[PDB]
C-alpha cells in the first residue's frame, strides 16, 4: 500500500483469502469491514500517527460513532480488491473516514463506506468537541475541499435510526466475545458488533439475499466479560431494524439498519 | 505465492495485519493457524485440486483433519512479513500429512513449524476409511517421495498420546457458540475456531505473563452450527503445561482433546 501522489489519500490491494469467504465463495461483510480498518491503520502509520501528539498528552482517542457500508459486488475468493481511503475534518464535531472499493482487474467501484469518529477521554470515557489546537495538527493530512464517498443529498449514510421496540421479531441471545474478537488494546473489535447484529437475521434471508447496505450506530462498548443480545425486526428488497443490548440490564450498545437484495 | 522449482512444495508471503495481532502486537496463534490453512488451500489449487481428487469426488470422499500440532519460536510482529512453505506426504493407507515451516522473510530464520494428520471420510455418512490404492496413486506425484518432516526428532511432541481430562476441570469456559464468521464456505465450523475455544479456558493471567510455545489438538467430532460447547482445562505441570477438553454442552460428547505448553515471558 501507499499514499497517493498528493499525499492526501491512501491505496492498498488485497487478495481475498479462503477463510475470508462465505457460502457464495465471496468475501463476507466482516472481511470487508476488517480490510477497511487495515487500510485506515496503514494510512495513519504512513503519515506519522490515530492519536496526534496533543491527543496523547490529553489522554484523548478517536472512537467510532457511526459506520455505513454499501456493497454492489462482493469480491470472489482469489480476486484482488483495491481500497482507497481518506479523512476529512468535520469542524469541531469530529472527523470522518471514507473508503472506495474497486475491482483491481476492471477498475469499477464495487463498494463504498463512510464512518463518523468522535473524540473521547480514554480514562473517563467522556465525549468532547475537537479543540482548535488538535484540529490544526491533522488538517494538513486531509483534502481541504470536500471529498465524499456518499455525495448524493438525503443519502442512507446520514439517516436517523430509531430504537427497536419489544417484542423483537427475531433474536440471538447470550453472545460473548472470545480472545479472537479483541484488538491489541484488549477492547472488542468494531467488526465483531457487525457480526453480532447479523446473527439475529434468519438463515433463510442470508441463503436467498445479499446484504447491500448496513448502517451501524455505536452507543457504548461491550466489555470482554459482557454478554449481548442481538434483536431484529423486519421494517419492509428486505429491510431490517437492529438493536444490540447487554443481556442483563438491557443497556443499549448499538442500533442499526440493513438492506438486502434478492439473489 | 508459488510452487517451488521441483513442484513438490509451495511458498507464500504474508504481511501481518493490525486486527490479526494480540496484546503483544504479534500475530495470535489463530492468525498463524488461518495462514497455514490459506497456504494449504493455495498449494491444492496450484496443482489442480478442489483437496479432493477426481476419484474422491466420484465416491463422495473428503479429507478431514485428525490432528494439528503447532510450535512457535517467535510470533511475527504487526507489519512484518512471514514466509510459509508447505508440502504433503502420503502415509500409506492411514492417510496423508501436511507440514509447514514458518520463516521471518527478513532474517530467513525458522520462527515456527507445524504438522497435521488427515484421514479420508465419506462426506454424507461421516464414516472413516483407509486410503485405497487408486486414490493414493492420483496424489503421490504431488508429494516428495522420500520422507520430509517438519518434526524429525525421535521422541517429538507431535506424535504424543493425549489423555482424556477427568472431571472436575481446574478451569472452564461454558456455553461457547459459533457465529457466521466461524463457518467456512461449506457452512462447517472452521478448524481454527476449535483452537480459539480450547484457549478460552486458559486464565487471562497465564496469557498476560506467558507465550504459547506448543499446541497439539486431536479432532474427534465436529461441532455443528447449532451446537454449544464447554472448554475445560487442567494444569499438568518455568514452563506451564495444560490438558484440554472440548465437549458438547448437554450430553458431554467429546469434540476435541489437546495439550498446550507455555513459557514465561
Ligand atoms: C484526521 N486523521 C486523524 C487525526 O488524529 C487522520 C488523517 C489522515 C490520516 C490519518 N488520520
Ligand atoms: C496429497 N494431497 C491431497 C490430495 O487429495 C495433496 C498434495 C499436494 C497438494 C494438495 N494436496
Annotate A76-109 with DSSP letters as a single string. BTT-EEEEEEEEEEETTTEEEEEEEEEETTT--E
Atom of ligand 1 nearest to the CA of A40: 10
Check B199 against A183: CB less than 8 A apart: no
CB A52 less than 6 A from any atom of ligand 1: yes
Of A175, A178, A189, the CB nearest to B19: A189
Tell the CATH superfamily of the B2-159 domain. Hotdog Thioesterase (3.10.129.10)
Q: Which helix (H) or strand (E) holds A138?
A: helix A132-138
The CATH topology of domain A2-152 is Thiol Ester Dehydrase; Chain A (3.10.129)
> Residue B79: its chain A contacts at CB < 8 A?
45
Give B171-264's CATH code, choosing from 3.10.129.10, 3.40.50.620, 3.40.190.10, 3.30.420.40.
3.10.129.10
CA of A112 to the centre of ligand 1 (A): 19
Is the Cβ–Cβ distance between A249 and A188 less than 8 Å?
no
CB A138 less than 6 A from any atom of ligand 1: yes
Beta-carbon contacts of residue B88 (< 8 Å; ≥ 6 apart): B43, B96, B97, B98, B99, B139, B142, B143
Q: Which helix (H) or strand (E) holds A241?
A: strand A238-246
Check A28 against B180: CB less than 8 A apart: yes
Can you give the residue ranges of every domain in chain B? 2-159, 171-264
SS3 string of chain B?
Answer: CEECCCCCCEEEEEECCHHHECCCCEECHHHHHHHHHHHHHHHHHHCCCCCCCHHHHHCCEEEEEEEEEEEECCCCECCCEEEEEEEEEEECCCEEEEEEEEEECCCCCEEEEEEEEEEEEECCCCCEECCCHHHHHHHHHHCCCCCCCCCCCCCCHHHCCCCCCCCCCCEEEEEECCCHHHECCCCCECHHHHHHHHHHCCCHHHHHHEEEEEEEEEECCCCCCCCCEEEEEEECCCEEEEEEEEEECCCCCEEEEEEEEEEEC
CA-based nearest distance B123→chain A, Å:
17
Task: Answer whether A2-152 and A170-262 agree in fold.
Answer: yes
Domain A170-262 has CATH 3.40.50.2300: no
Nearest residue to A210 via CA among A82, A110, A81, A113: A110
Resolution expressed in Å: 1.8
CA-based nearest distance A8→chain B, Å:
21
Is the Cβ–Cβ distance between B149 and B98 less than 8 Å?
no
CB-based contacts of A243-251 (< 8 A; 24+ apart in sequence): A243/A163, A243/A164, A243/A168, A244/A193, A244/A196, A244/A197, A246/A222, A247/A173, A247/A174, A251/A220
Beta-carbon contacts of residue B200 (< 8 Å; ≥ 6 apart): A178, A179, B173, B176, B231
Cis peptide bond upstream of B121, omega within 30: no
Q: Is A170 helix (H, G, I), strand (E, B) or coil?
A: strand
Dig out the grid coordinates for B17 from the structure.
495485519
CA-based nearest distance A78→chain B, Å:
9
Nearest ligand, CA B8: 2
CA of A100 to the centre of ligand 1 (A): 17
Q: Which helix (H) or strand (E) holds A175?
A: strand A170-175
- Which of A13, A15, A16, A19 would you mutate first to test chain B, the one with the most B CBs within 10 A? A19
The experimental technique behind this entry is X-ray
Amino acid at each position: 500500500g501507499s499514499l497517493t501522489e498528493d499525499g492526501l489519500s491512501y491505496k492498498e490491494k488485497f487478495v481475498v483469502r479462503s477463510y475470508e469467504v462465505g457460502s457464495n465463495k465471496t468475501a463476507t461483510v466482516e472481511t470487508i469491514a476488517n480490510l477497511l480498518q487495515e487500510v485506515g491503520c496503514n494510512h495513519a502509520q504512513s503519515v506519522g500517527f490515530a492519536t496526534t501528539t496533543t491527543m496523547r498528552k490529553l489522554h484523548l482517542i478517536w472512537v467510532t460513532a457511526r459506520m455505513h457500508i454499501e456493497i454492489y459486488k462482493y469480491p470472489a475468493w482469489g480476486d484482488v480488491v483495491e481500497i482507497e481511503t481518506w479523512c476529512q475534518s468535520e469542524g469541531r464535531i469530529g472527523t470522518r473516514r471514507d473508503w472506495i472499493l474497486k475491482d483491481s482487474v476492471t477498475g469499477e467501484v464495487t463498494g463504498r463506506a463512510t464512518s463518523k469518529w468522535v473524540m473521547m477521554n480514554q480514562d473517563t470515557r467522556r465525549l468532547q468537541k475537537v479543540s482548535d489546537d488538535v484540529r490544526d495538527e491533522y488538517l494538513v493530512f486531509c483534502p481541504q475541499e470536500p471529498r465524499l464517498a456518499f455525495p448524493e443529498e438525503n443519502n442512507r449514510s446520514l439517516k436517523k435510526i430509531p430504537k427497536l421496540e419489544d417484542p423483537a421479531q427475531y433474536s440471538m441471545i447470550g453472545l460473548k466475545p472470545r480472545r479472537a474478537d479483541l484488538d491489541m488494546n484488549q477492547h472488542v473489535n468494531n467488526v465483531t458488533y457487525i457480526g453480532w447484529v447479523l446473527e439475529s437475521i434468519p438463515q433463510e434471508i442470508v441463503d436467498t439475499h445479499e446484504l447491500q447496505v448496513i448502517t451501524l450506530d455505536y452507543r457504548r462498548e461491550c466489555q470482554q466479560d459482557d454478554v449481548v443480545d442481538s434483536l431484529t425486526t423486519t421494517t419492509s428488497d428486505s429491510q431490517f431494524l437492529h438493536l444490540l443490548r447487554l443481556s442483563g440490564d438491557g443497556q443499549e450498545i448499538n442500533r442499526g439498519t440493513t438492506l438486502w437484495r434478492k439473489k
